[PDB]
Amino acid sequence: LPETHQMLLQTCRDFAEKELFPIAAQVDKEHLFPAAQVKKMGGLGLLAMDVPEELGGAGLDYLAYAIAMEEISRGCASTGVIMSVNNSLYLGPILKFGSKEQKQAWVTPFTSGDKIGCFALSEPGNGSDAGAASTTARAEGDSWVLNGTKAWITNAWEASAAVVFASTDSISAFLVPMPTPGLTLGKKEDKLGIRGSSTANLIFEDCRIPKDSILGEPGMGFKIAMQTLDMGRIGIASQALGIAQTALDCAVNYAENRMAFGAPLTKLQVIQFKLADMALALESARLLTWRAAMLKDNKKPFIKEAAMAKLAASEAATAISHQAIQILGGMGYVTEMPAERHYRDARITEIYEGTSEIQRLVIAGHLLRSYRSAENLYF
Amino acid sequence: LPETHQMLLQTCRDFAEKELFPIAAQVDKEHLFPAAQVKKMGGLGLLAMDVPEELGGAGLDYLAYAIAMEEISRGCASTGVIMSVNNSLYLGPILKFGSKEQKQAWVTPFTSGDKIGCFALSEPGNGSDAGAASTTARAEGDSWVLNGTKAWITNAWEASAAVVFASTDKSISAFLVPMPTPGLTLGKKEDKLGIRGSSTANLIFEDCRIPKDSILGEPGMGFKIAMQTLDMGRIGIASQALGIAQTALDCAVNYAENRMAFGAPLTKLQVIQFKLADMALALESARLLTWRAAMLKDNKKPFIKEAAMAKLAASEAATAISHQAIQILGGMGYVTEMPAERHYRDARITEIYEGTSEIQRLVIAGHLLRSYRSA
Amino acid sequence: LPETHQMLLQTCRDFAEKELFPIAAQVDKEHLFPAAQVKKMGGLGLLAMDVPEELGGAGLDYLAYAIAMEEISRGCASTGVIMSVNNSLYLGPILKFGSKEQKQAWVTPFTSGDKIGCFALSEPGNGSDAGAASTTARAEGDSWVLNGTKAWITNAWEASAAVVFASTSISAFLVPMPTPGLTLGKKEDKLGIRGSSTANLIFEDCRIPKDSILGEPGMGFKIAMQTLDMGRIGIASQALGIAQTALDCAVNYAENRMAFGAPLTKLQVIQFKLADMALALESARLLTWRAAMLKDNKKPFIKEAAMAKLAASEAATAISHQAIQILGGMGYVTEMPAERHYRDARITEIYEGTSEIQRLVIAGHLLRSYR
Amino acid sequence: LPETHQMLLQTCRDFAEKELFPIAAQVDKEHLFPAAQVKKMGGLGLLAMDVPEELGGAGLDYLAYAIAMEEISRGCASTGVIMSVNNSLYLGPILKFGSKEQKQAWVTPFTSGDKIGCFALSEPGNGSDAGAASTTARAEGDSWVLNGTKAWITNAWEASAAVVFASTDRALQNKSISAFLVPMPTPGLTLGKKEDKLGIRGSSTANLIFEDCRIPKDSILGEPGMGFKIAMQTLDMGRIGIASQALGIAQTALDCAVNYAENRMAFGAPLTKLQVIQFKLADMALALESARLLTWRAAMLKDNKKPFIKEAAMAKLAASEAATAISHQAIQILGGMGYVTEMPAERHYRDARITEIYEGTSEIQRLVIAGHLLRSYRS
Ligand SMILES: Cc1cc2nc3c(=O)[nH]c(=O)nc-3n(C[C@H](O)[C@H](O)[C@H](O)COP(=O)(O)OP(=O)(O)OC[C@H]3O[C@@H](n4cnc5c(N)ncnc54)[C@H](O)[C@@H]3O)c2cc1C
Ligand SMILES: Cc1cc2nc3c(=O)[nH]c(=O)nc-3n(C[C@H](O)[C@H](O)[C@H](O)COP(=O)(O)OP(=O)(O)OC[C@H]3O[C@@H](n4cnc5c(N)ncnc54)[C@H](O)[C@@H]3O)c2cc1C
Ligand SMILES: Cc1cc2nc3c(=O)[nH]c(=O)nc-3n(C[C@H](O)[C@H](O)[C@H](O)COP(=O)(O)OP(=O)(O)OC[C@H]3O[C@@H](n4cnc5c(N)ncnc54)[C@H](O)[C@@H]3O)c2cc1C
Ligand SMILES: Cc1cc2nc3c(=O)[nH]c(=O)nc-3n(C[C@H](O)[C@H](O)[C@H](O)COP(=O)(O)OP(=O)(O)OC[C@H]3O[C@@H](n4cnc5c(N)ncnc54)[C@H](O)[C@@H]3O)c2cc1C
Ligand SMILES: CC(C)(COP(=O)(O)OP(=O)(O)OC[C@H]1O[C@@H](n2cnc3c(N)ncnc32)[C@H](O)[C@@H]1OP(=O)(O)O)[C@@H](O)C(=O)NCCC(=O)NCCSS
DSSP, rough: OOHHHHHHHHHHHHHHHIIIIHHHHHHTTTTOOOOHHHHHHHHHHHTTSSGGGGGSOOOOOOHHHHHHHHHHHHOOHHHHHHHHHHIIIIIHHHHHOOHHHHHHHHGOOOOOOOSOOEEEEBBBBBSSSGOOOOOOOEETTTTTEEEEEEEEETTTOOOOOEEEEOOOOOOEEEEEEOOTEEEOOOOOOOOOOOSOHHHHEEEEEEEEEEEEEEETTTTTTTHHHHHHEEEEHHHHHHHHHHHHHHHHHHHHHHHHHHETTEEEEEGGGGHHHHHHHHHHHHHHHHHHHHHHHHHHTOOOOHHHHHHHHHHHHHHHHHHHHOOOHHHHGGGGGGTSSSSHHHHHHGGGTTSSSSSSHHHHHHHHHHHHHHHHHHHTTTO | HHHHHHHHHHHHHEEEEEEITTTEEEEEETTTOHHHHHHHHHTTTEEEEEEEEGGGGOOOHHHHHHHHHHHHHHOOOOHOOOOOOOIIIIIIHHHHOHHHHHHHHTGGSOOOOOOOEEEOOOOTBBSGGGGGGOOOOEEETTEEEEEEEEEETTTTTTTTTEEEEOOOOOOOEEEEESSSSSTTEOOOOOOOSTTTTTOEEEEEEEEEEGGGGGGGGSHHHHTHHHHHHHHHHHHHHHHHHHHHHHHHHHHHHHHHHOOTTTTTGGGGGGHHHHOOOOOHHHHHHHHHHHHHHHHHHHOOOOHHHHHHHHHHHHHHHHHHHHHHHHHHHHHGBTTTTTHHHHHHHHHHHTTTTTOOOHHHHHHHHHHHHHHHHHH | OOHHHHHHHHHHHIIIIIITTTTTTHHTTOOOOOOHHHHHHHTTTSSTTTTTTGGGOOOOOOHHHHHOOOOOHHHHHHHHHHIIIIIIIIIIIHHHHHOOHHHHHHHHHGSSSSSOOEEEOOBBBBBBSSGOOOOEEEETEEEEEEEEEEEETTTTTOOSEEEEEEEEEEEEEEEEEEEEEEEOOOOOOOOOOSSOOEEEEEEEEEEEEGGGGEETOOOOOHHHHHHHHHHHHHHHHHHHHHHHHHOOOOHHHHHOOOOTEEEEGGGGHHHHHHHHHHHHHHHHHHHHHHHHHHHHOOOOOOHHHHHHHHHHHHHHHHHHHHHHHHHHHGGGGGGGHHHHHHHHHHGTTTTTTTTHHHHHHHHHHHHHHOO | HHHHHHHHHHHHHHHHIIIIGHHHHHHHHTOOOOOHHHHHHHHHTTTTTSSSGGTOOOOOOHHHHHHHHHHHHHHHOOOOHHHHHOOOOOIIIHHHHHHHHHHHIIGGGGGSSSOEEEEOOOOBBBSSSGGGOOEEEEEEEEEEEEEEEEEEEEETTTEEEEEEEEESSSSSTTSSSEEEEEEEEOTTTTEEOOOOOOOOOOEEEEEEEEEEEEEGGGGGGSTTTBHHHHHHHHHHHHHHHHHHHHHHHHHHHHHHHHHHHHEEEEEEGGGGGGGHHHHHHHHHHHHHHHHHHHHHHHHHHHHTOOHHHHHHHHHHHHHHHHHHHHHHHHHHHHHHGGGGGTSHHHHHHHHHHTTTTTSSSSSHHHHHHHHHHHHHHHO
């Protein structure tokens, strides 16, 4: 790693050990939003890593973001997803597709932890099938009028703004303030894990927003959504790496100190093998993530690469966390140790920002297009 | 299946649907012992299936037990482990190794739902390493004196008797201990990932005196009793794992038939079809292993390797099936509105208790090789 | 297991150890059809097991067949597939769908190892897509006229008769071999099961009598599908034999190979590999026997046959792989039988319906059970 | 990738396409050592990639070697192992541990494809247990006398020199082995019969039998008792070569399956229109790209003079298991055509299998990884 990125890593790891490890159990048990910690992170630049310093951000790159995301998620996975949604899914598309004015109004006040945003694509009847949005935007006067329900929205209860995708005929993106007349929140979902982040429906009933609330041009929405998810996928890959790293750390320390049949568990061959496979899966997932980050930072294509990273990391996080429980034994099954929380948090990384199935379809599609292109050059 | 085992399956299915399915979510949410339902199961003979009627049991066999155990656990996994501990781990060793008088005293009042037992082998410093028991039993006058802590005892807070293993020096012995009794305190209930309706806690013995006739079998038989008990228990846990797997698969199939994506049900996607075929294969395979082990036990044939195979297969299937059930549900899989996330949490214990998967592999390997050496 | 089935197991084991184990390497190395051993098997009844003794069969059941199949295949995988093709794919449909006269003409002469048969469904352009058959049968007078090429036909170069599927919409036909209008393609050069022959059947204006049709016109696809259900139990069992011999090999070796001061079997890792192998095999055998018993009791067994074949074939590949790994360097050379088991195992995931087709068949039945 | 490494990649691909692809079926079928092709590779620097130009080498690095190895092995797996043995196992130790005079005598004439070497560590009695060498070397006057059988020596029947490991001191149990440079032929050395192998059949494998074999005193590479260390550090490098070989086998297997799947029809469409086929292909691509990044990390650590034992073991482990899984799935996608020699898939499956065994089995790799993982946590 570069020197800068090494220092960043140490700052983030110190933060995580100081501020996140001591609350992780509480945040999870009580489904508690980590308010004070998100705000401190805001001051550190972690909620706006890839945002130009001129717009109020850290002025860093996606590799730095990937590194920071891992270290944060290692401390608290919920804190990780909150940070990832703000960077990749909220601020991301606004920097990419927004006017100078939209950036001033909707980026800058959301860079410091005073306000955060959210991303609303999924609906109760469709999440993988993104283009099947039934939520409608209709132009009427100096306004777009929004009607429908978005589902599963991370940060719904804490967000001051949302990038919302609505059918205009055919999908468009809109900047929506929160709260706003004609927008109500559903009840907070009761989740298996990442319990400190809020997840709730967004309910639009003749919600009016000004005409310049549209992000990009009408019909650009599906493309805005897909490109934003490419970036988001790197963030989720990093979160999954943090979850996996901390689960592995937990297994190693335990197994070194737990005695069985006369010696530490780490004298048993089978334990060494579990641990070696855990380390291989994690390091492999990490390199795929950094590849995808560096490609994005060099303005090269990264769709296949982000899908691979998210896929590899999420499945490693679930495998590794399972094996951490197994190595701990009975201690793995109770809330006295952190391993059972790891297994619970890990499990969402295979679902959100495109299920594993979707990721494979994306990779396959890009694989097959690349070979078809190479074939055509002959003709 | 025999006509009689078909009628049992239906009785159990009908009972789980009426009595367990409606309470499963609350039991899990509140960590709440299903006391009324256990008493009802007691009355149906389900807490003493392989006990002779003359001792107040159902007079059935281990095949019937595995079937009933699967149907119960399909309904509620916690009720499952509670039924299994009483049947296999508590009542089982007393039927196998007890005197006639011991069976009348310690089996018969635990055959009907009013009293249940527990099994206490594991300790804080040792669970897989069973023979490392540092709980001590010392002969003093008219009593055995017990000192030490047992850990992870399922049914600790509701149990009226325990089979406790303690070092007396072939250095371990098995003891019938009443609960409550002077010198015994319970630890705090464990806060578990799943099977939250079952209680789990430490048994703490300080100068705990029990009569000399409390010993089960002869002194030094303890390790053997424990190991042969776990063999029977493992068929019970395999059957619980099957029930968790079956209900997770039922959940995924009903959901996928009704959820639309890209114009049609999820079950029209080839990928989803493949998930469900793998799930069905793993489950049916595990069930046959389980039934093989039960039938061997029933015909008074060895079944150590076969019970370990069943427990290993079933339990790893439960975890794989329940994971895939969540995946098929999508977002709905990650929330308590659906039961998928509960099956995932419940399935996970089955790879740990009554011998970890690693312990299972070592047992299977040991018996494999003996079979080649005797050929 | 019944005592009758217990005795059959020992006869087949005895036979395999005397007649098959000593030639397995040669059969494989030289791609050599094991003609003398197949004749002896014919004399024992192994090539006509589920056939009534009135038609010269053994008069046994599919459970007996699956046991015998596993013992033969443990001895030599090519002898196993030759025997399975004759029992399940040739004689099977003729028994189930043929007339009295058809049985006497086409079964009775093929029950004793003098004459064996074959089953021709696949074509160069379609194997999984079995209904896509482009070979044609036209009715010209008191004959059928066949035109087209069938592909991958096991026993092609040794068979005296074939059950051939032709588009008429598909029908089944008994074709004698040799016959005017029929020629054989070159033998395939295979990764494994090299002692069985595999080749194309090429029909050019091939004329056969009108009474050659098996069942009614249009029944062909159903006859083919019901045949492959039976065949799948056979391949399951072939696969169990390969797997079993691979595991026998590994255990003997590991007990007697020293490393770091003890046998390999003293290493915890080797014990785990062995435990997983035994678990995969034993579970696959139970699925396989469930399918054979459902068939013997006239119960549906499509899904169960599919599960048995899928489980058994995937176990044969995983176990043979681990057999090579336990042997180390010795696993990679022809001095040991492990590399041959790896090569033989691999076909069982492909023929009689690929693993992917098995999963589709299983899923279809599963969903219908819930409807 | 640097422009230089991009040129090299194209050179090796072109060579492979021009010289290796057309001989691979024959080399495999007939167990034929591809001597003309190895000589040409020699002229291009491929047999001495990390050797300085001043000793007659290509003057490049291990990243270049890894890239070159993958392209060579894609064309012919046997040519790949022949090249890897010469680079990593023969030349490697001489460059790392040899004197100036040893480099001139034993490196320089083995850099051009006229003479290649071999590496003799394993014995009939022991491979994984490398330290149990019973072949002996006794100091007799001004000479060393060797007695014993080495087993499994790649290039045995074509080599003009060997790096040979022999027991020189059974009293000092951790300084027990020494390394020796031995010419081929030499009085006292005879070869065993060539092994009949599942795959990589163009390479020779056979026993080296020493009986009263006297070699001069300056034949010892490094100090007496250093042999086990020289051998282990040599295998660390070799593992990067073998990982690259395995990538090449996996890549050609994947190329094969994709071409077939796009062009084979079933149920009225190409196989690639089936989801399950797309899934098979996505998993293949992910396993390969992941293994490649692990390999490049290890090569890069070596080239930067950093520790790479764990990383080399991870790479060899990931690549070798990917090659076997990918080649297995290539056969499955071809269906019947996958089982016959008319297509190359069955050969890729046979070649891939060796990569899980030699230069330290998969089991040894996991023990190595676990050991270094644990040491990191302790430090
Ligand atoms: C805690 C949580 C937080 C979330 N955060 C956000 C957020 O902030 N903003 C937002 O917009 N959304 C968010 N999501 C939505 C999330 O991305 C979706 O749940 C996910 O995309 C899957 O969509 P779905 O739940 O509708 O499942 P479905 O689309 O019904 O999928 C069900 C199953 O079918 C599979 N499937 C679907 N299509 C195909 C296909 N073509 N081929 C093969 N298989 C297929 C899926 O992979 C899955 O296994 C969140 C969800 C959760 C649970
Ligand atoms: C909810 C719950 C209920 C339980 N019910 C009961 C009960 O009613 N009564 C009772 O006595 N106990 C009970 N158990 C205890 C249970 O059986 C043990 O947790 C289990 O045997 C593992 O023992 P351990 O927790 O001490 O883990 P450990 O023995 O510390 O093992 C930790 C890891 O090391 C591995 N390991 C251990 N030894 C070896 C070895 N030799 N080779 C390879 N790997 C090894 C294990 O497989 C595991 O992966 C229960 C546990 C729980 C969590
Ligand atoms: C040695 C050998 C012996 C054989 N014996 C006989 C014999 O005696 N008689 C006979 O008639 N045939 C025989 N077969 C043919 C064998 O059954 C076929 O190879 C098998 O059906 C696969 O068909 P295919 O080769 O045409 O491959 P394809 O049908 O082209 O399939 C290629 C790949 O696509 C997959 N695929 C195809 N359709 C689907 C789908 N809908 N969904 C998902 N995946 C799909 C396949 O599973 C496979 O993975 C033999 C083959 C061999 C190699
Ligand atoms: C074609 C070929 C080429 C080769 N090239 C060379 C060469 O050029 N020079 C050379 O010196 N050698 C060479 N080798 C030797 C190769 O590196 C060995 O085959 C390998 O190290 C395994 O050694 P073994 O065959 O003695 O197997 P064994 O050591 O007998 O092992 C057999 C099984 O036990 C396992 N095992 C052994 N020890 C342990 C342990 N402690 N824990 C867990 N599992 C263990 C192994 O993983 C393996 O699965 C070659 C081998 C082959 C087949
Ligand atoms: C052949 C194939 C494509 C079947 O799917 P498809 O072509 O769609 O055929 P189906 O959907 O079953 O429909 C055709 C009829 O065959 C019938 N059928 C299918 N399998 C049957 C079986 N096992 N028994 C009886 N009937 C069967 C179906 O019931 C169906 O009847 P209807 O038209 O009344 O609905 C595939 O699923 C399969 O099993 N292929 C076999 C591949 C194989 O084994 N190849 C190697 C053979 S030689 S080694």
